[PDB]
From a paper:
IMPDH is an essential enzyme that catalyzes the NAD+-dependent conversion of inosine 5′-monophosphate (IMP) to xanthosine 5′-monophosphate (XMP) in the de novo purine biosynthesis pathway. As the crystal structure of Mycobacterium thermoresistible (Mth) IMPDH (GuaB2) was elucidated during the course of this study, the modes of binding of seven compounds to Mth IMPDH were also analysed by X-ray crystallography and docking analyses performed for three others. All compounds were evaluated for structural analysis and co-crystal structures were obtained for seven of these, namely compounds 14, 18, 22, 27, 35, 37 and 45.
Replacement of the cyclohexyl by a cycloheptyl ring (compound 14) reduced both enzyme and whole-cell activities by approximately one order of magnitude (MIC90: 31.2 μM, IC50: 0.83 μM) while maintaining target selectivity. The co-crystal structure of 14 with Mth IMPDH confirmed the binding of this compound to the NAD-binding pocket of IMPDH in a similar manner to compound 1. In the first hotspot region, all of the analogues made extensive pi interactions with both IMP and A285 (A269 in the Mth structure). The tails of the enzyme inhibitors extended up into the second hotspot region, where they all made strong pi interactions with the Y487′ (Y471′ in the Mth structure) side chain from the adjacent molecule in the tetramer. The compounds 14, 18, 22, 27, 35, 37 and 45 were also able to make additional interactions to P61′ side chain from the adjacent protomer.
Author numbering:
A (entry chain A), B (entry chain A), C (entry chain A), D (entry chain A): 15 to 291, 316 to 369
Write the structure that this text describes.
């Protein structure tokens, strides 16, 4: 084997990230303004804009969830707070009209009680929220939830980075599979644990397991430009989950921070020391971006342009677009 | 598939840009001073120097077009101004002697009226000027123009980045095909839309569709050194269109700008916020370079050297030169 | 041959280093806190933590060796000092309880006398400590030691970077093979001699020769993050030897250095001019890190996380994990 | 074709430079101090140290040539000066004992008269000194010289970067072939003309044409570390020509320059504007390095280390060593 040893499976794949590829233009009759940006968040729930906000305590509380839903997407309420408080945020969102909202749960002992309280509060989507879903306890939580509240609530499972992991969540009954182990902007898992999977390759692999079963893939983490959203969907994802890109907005939790005459907001990993109080995230800053509505408009504008270039009238068509792989020189 | 999924066509190609390749020397009897630099701009029009200036409002108005033609190349007048004004610039160039000149038109409603006014003003080349020519409206404009004014005016279509797109323009009747989706120095399409195609690969693909029909390819965008002009022609292009390399010249529109004791001129994308008033270009600065005549001399000097090294007595011979692909270490 | 010449064996392999790969997650029932981190240092000696400290005079003297053993690993006492002094450090470690300790010897004339003095002092592991073990004098020293004191003392040989070299040490009777020619943080062999072998590939190759004979591989050099320890073990190593990561600790030799308001300690190659008094190492600084116990806890924490992600209940299982190769864009 | 077009020969090779490869250690009985560093400069002339100084006016005049010969290598006197003056420098070197010396000639009209004057002055090696030897005028000069003064003087031809070019010089009668089109530290040919060939690949290709005819290859340009000398010889070169590495020495032409409290010397391309008075070189600075004797000692020390690691008792053995290719991450 050219890279060493005698086992060709030891190095299993060549992993591409977003910066490794570009979308190829294709024959087009599609005007960006007329493209249909709607897409499946789960088997049953279709969003007008294929974007959801991360379940992080510097990204999504009630204010963000409301703004995301109004913009045509959805928020996923973080779970780094008491059950009663998270449930009250669900109620707060549902009081602001017929707005979709999701909420994160874990797989701990209090996870089941948290999920039932969220159901009682009227939540539409429960996100079983882990860093590694390929695990009996996670698969069991997904299955138990689906069998118990599945008629009324859609159950998302994640995160995965391999085909087999995605397959396991599908068999467990997930209504959507969330992809991303290691790609987050504030992630240190790759240097702390040495574990990860570049996100374009991870999406391609997850989609190979989910699409034949009609299960939507959520691309979670590593998106830094509006162009990355188009790439994620073209790789086969149905929606993208965003942390860093939304953390700088007025609707995100937290105050403005002034450093060197410039405005920022804090953005921290849920695995950072601060969030937990062996960290796998950092605490950082992102530039202040203004209102969420305007950020979403710019992000969707980029996606619409990609749909024009690729001749994709719908997200389903964009999922069939082709890539070109680029070199380092294509900085 | 090593990069993910089960579909080998999902990632269609490995895209090389100019920095990825070098020209290999070959047996030579050619002195740089004696090389013939003439090349086809279109099926009928041959230039003494294979260079045209970009149709941008910080690069080509009448003064630039006149200087380019005198230097043996051609200018393409930008269209970010009223029809009457653009037509008056055509007249101004034709009044300065028997000088070749081209002018950009769009595919909007006013595009046809613009084209006829340019024809009346005496224009030699009409450039159907879009970011994505693989589109019924663009192909129809090219065809209508060719059938209507084709005997007197050469019609250029662009831009394309794929073989099929170039083929479609050829069938539509284009007299030259312009290549470049995403490579421009001031371009943000790659980060906004996630769309693009590295330019050496794009030229190779376009040429595979155009050369068998005797249609010249114009390499448009991403050229930053005189050496890139040689590479573009060796990949099979017949001419190169330059923006950044000519924007710093005395003949370009705009004033000198002094920052930190150094001289610059503004250079902005036609898709920048400033030009349009979702932007796909930026507004920037380029160093002031002095007279156009001298810049062209230096650029052509580099091309002549390449022709000496490769034993290319003509541009047609240079189009048959070979490359070596380099690694990152070859910075 | 695509890279030149007619001999496909001239460029023998594509060498990967730690930054070239990530560990893929796999099905897991393993809790990080419950993972078994024990591993073979040699055929007979198993450590609770698979880490040993480098035999360098800015890393391991008696204080470090004691702390490493207490933390569940081991120290290898450097040999840049008189035989009597090194032997006294062995005694000092053994006086602090039933603590494992190793000590470096060379292959010079005084090497044999040094080894016997270390044996008399009660050493558990002798490390035949060279930059290139594939050499008759090194193989002879390993063999002589094994045959003479092998019943009481384990003999480590190194360093190697190729399969054949590792094979030769195995046949010579080594109880463990140490891998690393050129990867050290303070190493200049790669620029001075142009010699080296990227460490993931070197480990894969050494393991292919050692594992079928039941001989553990020690990955030595180039480890800069806790994640690199997981990668080294997953490539097939049984332990990792650390220099830079431990040189900043309270237990390492040397004083604190203050530069620009920040605390550092000196860290220098044993091939640096300072250590020898043609250098193949530099003298540098590393940040002060505090107590060794805490550094080891953080390093092992990272390893435990990797074992959770990969479903590895033991180091033997981690050695069967798979990689994904990443590109430059995966910075 | 994956990179574009339908012609697999368009991109002819993947070109490696020195930074792309490392030498693999191999079984060794060779002590660095005992390695034989002698090598053929030409078919007849063997040097004790396989190094020659560049024919540049900031590197080699009489003082450098004398010092190089005394160190066991050779200097090649530059030709950017009157014939009488260059010839007087030859005389000056021969007056300092039985010291080998070479001198550069061109292929212009005055080239023949220059060569005869150098022969009369007692020169040992004539270097036909061009940037592209694959040319009838260069091949004719080599042949004419060999047939006219070949019994007394060795004739070097260069530069080449391809197998066919090297073959042509061999057939012309060259006693050594010099390799390097574009790799020089002060070279801008790659950005001006877009022409070049990475040096490890260029050496491998030239050697494939020269070695079967017993003609030594001189690796010229791009060497920045002592380790690059080992790599060049291992790729099959017999000697290396150095510019930048020797330009900082006391024996090089020019004065010391003080900038920001540090000592430098000027180093400029023979194709720089300053040397010619379309430039293909720059004028730069290199750090002051002290006496040549000491620089050579350090360079040879590195080579000796490489010979120890690779088990090469002679340069002929080193030419049979193997490489490993490294990635970008192996910075
Ligand atoms: O429960 C774990 C264990 C994972 C399973 C394997 C054993 C290691 C621990 N966590 C807790 C959550 N995360 S995280 O907050 O950083 C995280 C949050 C969501 C998405 C992630 C995607 N990739 C990395 C980290 C992510 C860290 C690790
Ligand atoms: O009309 C469009 C639409 C393109 C078709 C697909 C839908 C998206 C919009 N424009 C308008 C012009 N450009 S541009 O000015 O930036 C532009 C000018 C010329 C050459 C380009 C080459 N590559 C990128 C941008 C370029 C932006 C996009
Ligand atoms: O004895 C030698 C000879 C090596 C054999 C081939 C001939 C060259 C000399 N030494 C002495 C020790 N080292 S070192 O201290 O830098 C060193 C220490 C341990 C691990 C090394 C791993 N890779 C590089 C250097 C290393 C330098 C060279
Ligand atoms: O005579 C030429 C022509 C070359 C043949 C093809 C046509 C172009 C001109 N020169 C003159 C010398 N050089 S140089 O001084 O820069 C030069 C000096 C030696 C080694 C070189 C190696 N690679 C690049 C430049 C080098 C520049 C070009
Ligand atoms: O602490 C952490 N370490 C690693 N990943 C995290 C952490 N916290 C959240 N994440 C994940 O990173 C995603 C956000 O990534 P981003 O959009 O690139 O910032 C989130 O939706 C999580 O999947
Ligand atoms: O705003 C923009 N975004 C992307 N491409 C542009 C824009 N404006 C002009 N272009 C194209 O970029 C070319 C100039 O590229 P440059 O020579 O690299 O600066 C132009 O000829 C256009 O094809
Ligand atoms: O001077 C030197 N040059 C090259 N390698 C060295 C030198 N001194 C020690 N080493 C090796 O580098 C290892 C430490 O590497 P590190 O952990 O990356 O700093 C040591 O255990 C040695 O194998
Ligand atoms: O002006 C120039 N441009 C390109 N190459 C040059 C020039 N002048 C000298 N050279 C070549 O560069 C070699 C020195 O390269 P260096 O050792 O990397 O600095 C010289 O021996 C020449 O072959």
């Amino acid at each position: 084997v050219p890279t060493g040893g005698d086992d060709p499976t030891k190095i299993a794949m060549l992993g591409l990230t977003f910066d490794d590829v570009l979308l190829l233009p294709a024959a087009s009759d599609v005007l960006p303004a007329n493209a249909d940006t709607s897409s499946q968040l789960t088997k049953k729930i279709r969003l007008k804009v294929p974007l959801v906000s991360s379940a992080m305590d510097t990204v999504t509380e009630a204010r963000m969830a409301i703004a995301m839903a109004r913009a045509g997407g959805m928020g996923v309420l973080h779970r780094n707070l008491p059950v009663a408080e998270q449930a009250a945020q669900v109620e707060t969102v549902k009081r602001s009209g017929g707005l979709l909202v999701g909420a994160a749960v874990g797989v701990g002992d209090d996870a089941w009680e948290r999920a039932m309280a969220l159901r009682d509060a009227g939540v539409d989507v429960l996100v079983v929220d882990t860093a590694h879903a390929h695990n009996r306890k996670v698969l069991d939580m997904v299955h138990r939830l689906k069998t118990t509240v599945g008629d009324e609530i859609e159950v998302v499972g994640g995160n995965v980075a391999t085909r087999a992991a995605a397959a396991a969540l599908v068999e467990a009954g997930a209504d959507a599979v969330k992809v991303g182990v290691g790609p987050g902007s504030i992630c240190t898992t790759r240097v702390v644990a040495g574990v990860g999977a570049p996100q374009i390759t991870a999406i391609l692999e997850a989609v190979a397991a989910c699409a034949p079963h009609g299960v939507p893939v959520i691309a979670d983490g590593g998106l830094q430009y509006s162009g990355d959203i188009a790439k994620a969907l073209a790789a086969g994802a149905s929606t993208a989950m965003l942390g860093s890109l939304l953390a700088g907005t007025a609707e995100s939790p937290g105050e403005l921070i002034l450093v060197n005459g410039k405005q920022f907001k804090s953005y921290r990993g849920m695995g950072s020391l601060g969030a937990m109080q062996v960290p796998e995230g950092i605490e950082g800053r992102v530039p202040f971006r203004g209102p969420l509505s305007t950020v979403i408009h710019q992000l969707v504008g980029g996606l619409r342009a990609a749909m024009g270039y690729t001749g994709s009238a719908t997200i389903e068509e964009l999922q069939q677009a082709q890539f070109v792989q680029i070199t380092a020189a294509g900085l």
